[PDB]
Amino acid sequence: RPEHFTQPYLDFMTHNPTVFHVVDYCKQKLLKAGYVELPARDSWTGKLVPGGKYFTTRNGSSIIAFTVGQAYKPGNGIAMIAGHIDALTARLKPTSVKPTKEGYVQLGVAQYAGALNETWWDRDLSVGGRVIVKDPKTGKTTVKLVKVDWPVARIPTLAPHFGIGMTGHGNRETEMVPVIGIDNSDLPVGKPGSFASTQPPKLVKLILSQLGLSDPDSILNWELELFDAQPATVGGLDKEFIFAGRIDDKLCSWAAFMALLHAKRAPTDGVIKLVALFDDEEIGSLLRQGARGNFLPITIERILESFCSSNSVPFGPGILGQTYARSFLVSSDVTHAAHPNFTQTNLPGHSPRLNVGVALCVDTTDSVSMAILDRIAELSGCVNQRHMIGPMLSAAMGVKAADVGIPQLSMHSIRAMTGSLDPGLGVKFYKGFLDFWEEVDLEWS
Amino acid sequence: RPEHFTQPYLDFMTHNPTVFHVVDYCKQKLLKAGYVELPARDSWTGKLVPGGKYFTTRNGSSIIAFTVGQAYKPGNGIAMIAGHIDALTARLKPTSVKPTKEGYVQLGVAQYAGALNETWWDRDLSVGGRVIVKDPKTGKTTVKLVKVDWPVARIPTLAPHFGIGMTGHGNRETEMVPVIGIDNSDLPVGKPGSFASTQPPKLVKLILSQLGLSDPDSILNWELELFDAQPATVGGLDKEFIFAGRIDDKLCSWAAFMALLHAKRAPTDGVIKLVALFDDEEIGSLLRQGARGNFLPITIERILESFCSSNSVPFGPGILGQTYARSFLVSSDVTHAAHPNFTQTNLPGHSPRLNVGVALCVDTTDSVSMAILDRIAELSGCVNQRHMIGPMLSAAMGVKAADVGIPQLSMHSIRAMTGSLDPGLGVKFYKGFLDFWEEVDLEWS
Amino acid sequence: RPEHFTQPYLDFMTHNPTVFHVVDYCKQKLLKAGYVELPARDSWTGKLVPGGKYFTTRNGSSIIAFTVGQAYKPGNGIAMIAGHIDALTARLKPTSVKPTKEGYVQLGVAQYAGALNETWWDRDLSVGGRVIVKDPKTGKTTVKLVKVDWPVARIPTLAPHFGIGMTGHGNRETEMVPVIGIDNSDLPVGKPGSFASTQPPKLVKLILSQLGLSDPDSILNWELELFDAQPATVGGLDKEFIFAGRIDDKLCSWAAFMALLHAKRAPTDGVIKLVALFDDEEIGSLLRQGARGNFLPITIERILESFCSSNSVPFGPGILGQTYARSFLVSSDVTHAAHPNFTQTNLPGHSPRLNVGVALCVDTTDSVSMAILDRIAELSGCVNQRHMIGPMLSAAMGVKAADVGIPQLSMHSIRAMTGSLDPGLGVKFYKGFLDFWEEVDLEWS
Ligand SMILES: [Zn+2]
Ligand SMILES: [Zn+2]
Ligand SMILES: [Zn+2]
Ligand SMILES: [Zn+2]
Ligand SMILES: [Zn+2]
Ligand SMILES: [Zn+2]
């Protein structure tokens, strides 16, 4: 079964370039699997029920999905997995328009997370994100997703012949300005104060067509980024490899998500099985949608308070915290696979292989956490590797936790690699955790 | 009386080398003094009663102990002390086994804190920690403490004759690899995939005998570290000094703990007297057992909600926070004593002496905090010093707070020093705070 | 049998911290074994006898002991071993008193031979040496040994927090000044011209109590040093290691000494068997008690002249030198064992192992010397190693010679390392040399 996840992972990576696409992807699969959305502005305290499946969203870039076991009662524990779905990228400036320079049309961008490193030069870049549109019919402000299907942007290297490097000194504001087109005419869209006037005129027209809008003044704002247009693929002589960009945690997040969809719901399951995918981890994770934010804790408190009303039980501290005491959090970010050409950096016995299994990262993880996940791995038919050179929902909730990752090479590159079976082996371990946590917890004292 | 704590402190330091021994030490003395343990998974909302004495544990490395005044009612303040019981130490790697090299058997370790500094060379190192054992009788997973009573490990310097230093370049992964034994045979324990196989065979057998086990496959994991085998002692011509390692906060923590054990329970005490000892402050103090984690706030809320049930009072924000507004938090970490040989680093009037009293550390502390603790010091018969070059439970609970410390030389050394009266003077001040806080708070407006 | 020397070596190291204690230790064992002291101011030319046993002393820091074979006649050779019993240490200055500074009482000291090094920081240091006392009963000037049984002194590191290192710039004069006590009174013994007045007042009183003396002016002078108070011990998982300080040649000297005490006296022994232990090799060994001084040569000439009287043979050059031509000198200083973490410094084939045997050091040693001692090792049941990166009584006497050493790690550290069987393996070899030299010499031409 692990190879059964290779191409679905490939298609996921290719067609969901931005964090907004990822949540939209997860949201449509959860709805087709029968999950019910819980809007934050609505009262939940009536409507949660054992055997139910739910999800909730924040800023359309953060999502928490969970299933409540049929044997669930207030005070029972949660098996939860956390990951981040943001990736290093380059966002269009509030004013992205630039002067046409030596006949080239350029684009103002800002490196989001420190993204524009040497691997970004001479890549075919496309654009995508969300647009804030004022709907023609309703007069309500809305959000729509957009993507250009061919490369519009590029950051060109300089020839080595000039004595500098090809990358120059590497300065991102002067030398890394993307090139989006040609205008040689030396040989404008929207009312002068509008948003559209701050952006390149063909970018606006291109975006308006994809949204089926004609009036530039319908666009209040957008959030757009550049991403590598090259599809995810398998490679190697035997196709053991996956080549794709944005692997830093779209990989572990996708695996955790698929784990939840594929998890058991046994009539005897007494725990809540939960996956939390967060935005903004490469900036530290503290923002409304980040992992150091209220999002997951207040969601958990809402769920528990909801079941407390149904059972006429008082909600408070220590019904919460009897819950936390019975819970376990797997915090999953990608880890470094053994690098064959920098062996300086491979700590022996602690440097994970590709196409083997998940690595337990140690420096959150500790002897108890490792005993728990090694045991789960055995019930799952998984082998757990070790790696050493937002993990800290653990502190916010006082939940026992471990750091866990799928091995990867060239982390933070615009295009990285893992083994072709690593997504599936990931799904296999996470599913093993959600399914066996409650059983394993009862083997302790 | 301060001298009456010198040998008890000595014995404490000598026989409790790891954070797990410290909690076990506190737990046995709390139980012998009649404290009741509150397990997180159980409901407390019935049990708590004025005049009662309790404690709670997290991961066996974090502990919170408190007494409820007989005059206590919901809304009354808490007099609380926080400290950390972790110390810089070197933890065994997940795979601690190494190739025998030039006839030596070595041990894979990782500096936990940033610990392995120059003072760690040529010290007699022993090993200790916790083991995750599979009880053959019950079949339940358990935890046991272990210690080897003689030095097993050493990090040898190089002779100066070779042109390098004795310490070399100081690189921790190549040049400081402990040496645990000799094997010259060039002139194995457990099923090949088990945990025992990742460890030195001879350490595993040594650990199994200490725990009275035969089969290597009964050990699922362990958490072991290296510590200095040399006992704590008194020193100097007049025995004014205490020479011991791991003083960075085992000292302030132990004195705080003893203050609680020695505090008044007057029939007129209306506050709660609490001590919180945390793990992982040298790592920034957030994960599950850390100081910027859930542990102390959720415990306090649980206690308050419990007494709210008993008195049929609603629990919520503003019964909590009336509580916080009547509270005070002494966050106690060790401080730097005047160093006689680096006088450049001694800020005059702000550089505390040994065998005098506790230092108020200023850079949390403020004119109000100092007014209170100077006032408590006067009722206690104490003299407070000043020091200047997890404090931030204060922000999490909005509690009035100060940073307080017992002066020390050679902080973060494998072996440090303070005055022989400094533990006692510590207990004396902390006891003064817990006993007099409520009285002092009523002198204000 | 080599294990039979482990604890007696451990006890020797622990209780004889200074060169003065070493000579006193050797002296009482020689006397208990029936050796006769030869005072330098007395004529010996009557009093030496075949089968006799004798020793001689210089400054109470140097000693030469020997046995005369029963078959001895003038012109017969000597099997002699030479070593040094001084060790790197810190002497008290002539005026050790210091100003009390920031409440600390300090002690003026001087490094004896580049001794204070990185490993001397944060060690528990005690004091010992000899005292020159004025005898009240007799009025004679005399010498007494003294040792304090608990740590009186410490050289404290600075916390890393201050931006310097813990060791500072390392300057031994301002930054390494030992700390002996506390005086906070800012919050004396003897006539003002006497020796006692130049020293710390409580040091003087402490020393006087140990010698059972009341009057400070009975002390004319003393020679005192700081040494590591930590006992010698065995360590390692199976206790294959010895951890002790001052191993540089207390180890080889002690082994040589016990070899003499354990040597054969066969009725057919025709050679003198002799051990010379010298002071000050770390200073290059020229002064009265050093190895480049007259001590051993003039003692040998005295012995030879004495037996020339008894046999009415003329003494002169060429009865001496027939003697030297039949002799052999084993010059024994410790050597560097293979270091497992600096392999750059281990010369393959030439880097000796712990718990194997003595290494023959080559750079005095030569093809002839090696053939002799390899042959002696075979008769003794010993394994000789090779080592490669004052031996020069060889030049003074024109005696054939070799440099041999017991391997050791971290030479010149305040606390070094050897194998637990290495002292024993040392005495086994040295005994082999003394017993078999005459036999082996007759296998040559
Ligand atoms: Zn990252
Ligand atoms: Zn990541
Ligand atoms: Zn610290
Ligand atoms: Zn601290
Ligand atoms: Zn030396
Ligand atoms: Zn030497």
Numbering used by the authors:
A (entry chain C), B (entry chain A), C (entry chain F): 50 to 236, 246 to 421, 427 to 452, 463 to 518
Per the authors:
The earliest discovered selective autophagy pathway in Saccharomyces (S.) cerevisiae is the cytoplasm‐to‐vacuole targeting (Cvt) pathway, through which hydrolytic enzymes are sequestered into double‐membrane vesicles, termed Cvt vesicles, and transported to the vacuole 8, 9. The best‐characterized cargo component of the Cvt vesicle is the vacuolar aminopeptidase I (Ape1) 16. Ape1 is synthesized in the cytosol as a 55‐kDa zymogen that includes an N‐terminal propeptide (hereafter referred to as prApe1), which oligomerizes into a dodecamer 17, 18 and further assembles into larger aggregates in a propeptide‐dependent manner 19. In addition to prApe1, Atg19 also binds another cargo hydrolase α‐mannosidase 1 (Ams1) 25, 26 via a site distinct from the prApe1 binding site, thus forming the Cvt complex.
In order to further improve the resolution of the mApe1 EM structure, we used an Ape1 homolog of 40% sequence identity from the thermophilic filamentous fungus Chaetomium (C.) thermophilum (ct‐mApe1) 30, to exploit increased stability of dodecameric species when compared with sc‐mApe1. Moreover, we determined the crystal structure of ct‐mApe1 organized in dodecamers at 2.8 Å resolution. In the crystal, ct‐mApe1 is present as dodecamers, which are formed by two asymmetric units each containing six ct‐mApe1 molecules. Cartoon representation of ct‐mApe1 structure including the catalytic domain (cyan) and the ancillary domain (magenta). The binuclear Zn2+ center bridged by the bidentate ligand Asp259 of the active site is located at the top of the catalytic domain. A conserved histidine residue (His163) belonging to the neighboring subunit protrudes into the active site. Dimerization via the ancillary domains forms the edges of the tetrahedron (left). A book page view along one of the body diagonals reveals the catalytic sites (Zn2+, yellow spheres) that are buried inside the hollow tetrahedral core (right). The superposition shows a close structural overlap of the dodecamer assemblies except for a noticeable difference in the active site that is well defined in our structure due to the presence of the cofactor zinc, but disordered in the sc‐mApe1 crystal.
